[PDB]
Design a protein around this ligand. Structure first.
Ligand SMILES: *[C@@H]1O[C@H](CO)[C@@H](O[C@@H]2O[C@H](CO)[C@@H](O)[C@H](O)[C@H]2NC(C)=O)[C@H](O)[C@H]1NC(C)=O
Lengths: 49, 98, 49, 18, 49, 18
């Protein structure tokens, strides 16, 4: 378990980091391509920021 | 006249008399009982602020269903095993299609 | 509106509309974008409103 | 009503409820 | 009228006033509203006036 | 008299002058 817990913790950290890519964070969508393909640059700057 | 603000995208048809005052209206207008609907006044000599404007509101939504409404963009041939920019019903992105 | 090819570009350059304001989408960029449904609400509104 | 973001990708969360 | 507590709900519900017209304010919404100064002008006006 | 909007927020700009 001492060896397996390190692997489990690292996998959990990586999984959380990956899951964080699907959060709006206040923008209109979590996908950057959708923001780029829906809004003009001046409006898309806020969502990208 | 209404009891509370509308929720977004809500429609109300009921013409019940608003009971603004403490006196019950009992379904008939009178003291503190006003008709919920009001008539507009539009004349050819009315000012621009009172001129009637014919307005339309367009709304779009995607429900991970078939893309029924699309644009006049013309589709092209299919390319495999090459790093290309795909666009499947708006699924904009890049990658290798195999 | 469903199951039909749309064309918002002609509506854009028709120049017969006093106000053309879009929120969450770019007037010149939804021409090549797809949606499942489109809702059109119509009514008559006073000038100051 | 207010619909979940999972069921709507591009549209607004609020839907017709009148 | 100042530096006191008013009560417009009883005046609205008195049902003894022939005309109760409010301009720029809702008669049933100023109960929870506060004003710095209140001016009361009283006189006699003909029925047709 | 008439007062600027910077001094009165809710009430009418016109004030008593009689
Ligand atoms: C669908 O029909 C039902 C049945 O009439 C409606 O339910 C009524 O709703 C009103 C106001 O919301 C209530 O006063 C009634 O008590 C409800 N029941 C009945 C049996 O009338 C419902 O509102 C309708 N929904 C829509 C969207 O039209």
């Amino acid at each position: 378990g001492k060896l397996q817990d390190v692997v489990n913790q690292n996998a959990q950290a990586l999984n959380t980091l990956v899951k964080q890519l699907s959060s709006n964070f206040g923008a209109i969508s979590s996908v950057l391509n959708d923001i780029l393909s829906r809004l003009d640059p001046p409006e898309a700057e806020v969502q990208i920021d | 006249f209404r009891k509370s603000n509308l929720k977004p995208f809500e429609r109300d048809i009921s013409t019940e008399i608003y009971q603004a005052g403490s006196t019950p209206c009992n379904g008939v207008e009178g003291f503190n009982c006003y008709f919920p609907l009001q008539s507009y006044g539009f004349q050819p000599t009315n000012g621009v602020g009172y001129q009637p404007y014919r307005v339309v509101v367009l709304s779009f939504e995607l429900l991970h269903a078939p893309a029924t409404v699309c644009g006049p963009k013309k589709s092209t041939n299919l390319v495999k095993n090459k790093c290309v920019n795909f666009n499947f019903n708006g699924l904009t992105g890049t990658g290798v299609l195999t | 509106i469903s199951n039909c090819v749309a064309d918002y570009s002609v509506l854009y350059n028709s120049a017969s509309f006093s106000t053309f304001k879009c929120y969450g989408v770019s007037p010149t960029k939804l021409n090549d974008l797809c949606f499942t449904n489109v809702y059109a609400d119509s009514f008559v509104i006073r000038g100051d409103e | 009503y207010r619909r979940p973001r999972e069921q709507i990708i591009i549209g607004s969360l609020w839907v017709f409820c009148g």
